[PDB]
Amino acid sequence: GMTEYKLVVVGAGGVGKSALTIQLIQNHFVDEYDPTIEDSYRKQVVIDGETCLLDILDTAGQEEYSAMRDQYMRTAEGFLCVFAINNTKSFEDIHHYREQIKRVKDSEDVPMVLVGNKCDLPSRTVDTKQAQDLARSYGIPFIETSAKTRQGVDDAFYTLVREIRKHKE
Amino acid sequence: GMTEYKLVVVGAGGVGKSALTIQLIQNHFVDEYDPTIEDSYRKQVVIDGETCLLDILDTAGQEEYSAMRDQYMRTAEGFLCVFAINNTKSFEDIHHYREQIKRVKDSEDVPMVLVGNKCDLPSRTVDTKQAQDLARSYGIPFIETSAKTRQGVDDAFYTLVREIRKHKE
Ligand SMILES: Nc1nc2c(ncn2[C@@H]2O[C@H](COP(=O)(O)OP(=O)(O)O)[C@@H](O)[C@H]2O)c(=O)[nH]1
Ligand SMILES: Nc1nc2c(ncn2[C@@H]2O[C@H](COP(=O)(O)OP(=O)(O)O)[C@@H](O)[C@H]2O)c(=O)[nH]1
Ligand SMILES: [Mg+2]
Ligand SMILES: [Mg+2]
Secondary structure (H helix, E strand, O other): OOOEEEEEEEEOOOOOHHHHHHHHHHOOOOOOOOOOOOEEEEEEEEEOOEEEEEEEEEOOOOOOOOHHHHHHHHHOOEEEEEEEOOOHHHHHOHHHHHHHHHHHHOOOOOOEEEEEEOOOOOOOOOOHHHHHHHHHHHOOOEEEEEOOOOEOHHHHHHHHHHHHHHHHO | OOOEEEEEEEEOOOOOHHHHHHHHHHOOOOOOOOOOOOEEEEEEEEEOOEEEEEEEEEOOOOOOOOHHHHHHHHHOOEEEEEEEOOOHHHHHOHHHHHHHHHHHHOOOOOOEEEEEEOOOOOOOOOOHHHHHHHHHHHOOOEEEOEOOOOEOHHHHHHHHHHHHHHHOO
16 A cells, blocks of 8 residues: 555654654644653655655653554664754764664664754754764764754655665665 | 557646646547546547557646556656646746656656646736746746647647657657
């Protein structure tokens, strides 16, 4: 049937993983989303003229057991690694998330996008060059996003889908 | 195996995409064809003395998933972009369709014809020069048609096929 793409959003708490998911799914910005809510979202889209379904797991803290986490991490085809451009710690924490994906997927070639969220905020502590440099080093795309403005949210998810398509071609 | 040309008709609802297809297929003008109906038509024709088959998808621009739509947009060889000369909005909407075509065909060199329909009407708000100028900008032909009078309907479709023949030359 219709192609399904299983995506997982990873990153340090507070970077805007839920705001980005919900912007994509529900086309609105939520100012408060309880940190501990972990859940998956399905949305039909058209990417480069291809009608497909995005199956997205919005991840929370790595403390608590999630039955959903097990299946997705196992079966996921693509990952958004999200940092916040006003959170230096979160950008420093990116290599971790990527090394955990490689280990769980037992593979050095997992489709991934590097996402710098909160581009709507005027004091960046993580600049464009540093983000471009990391992504280049990983051989993945970097996309600047605002969950509040919708800036580049579609771009990030569509770029991961395109990255998955190339992993099969 | 007889040569098949897969054509897709695109444009804003109400420009006469269905009227033009049915004029070509059934050699009559239909005043009432459900705006939301999308389907494909196959018709044997003779172009410049070549007996070929036209496989045309008359698009309705609907939301629900259609495997046939996806197949046609991916496998198509040529596109009619249709506006109505008494519909300024529809001519303004032409760039959107061309950009969708570029994205799905993964190319900036896709056989295309710009079609200005309803030249039987005296209330023209989109003049010949502006249509010629857009087509020149895109590097494609512009053809004036009337589904009701059957003016240039054959010309529109046969012009697209010739454009496809040159792409494959
Ligand atoms: N200005 C701004 N605030 C954002 C953005 N994304 C998330 N936020 C806010 O940052 C906080 C954390 O967002 P949340 O989605 O809970 O983060 P998560 O735990 O990483 O999923 C909330 O107050 C959000 O409203 C963004 O792009 N811009
Ligand atoms: N006068 C005139 N009316 C037309 C012409 N082509 C279509 N129509 C009418 O305009 C409307 C739109 O036609 P339709 O085929 O439904 O457009 P579509 O939605 O683009 O497929 C219908 O009421 C048609 O009868 C034309 O060349 N001249
Ligand atoms: Mg959250
Ligand atoms: Mg129609």
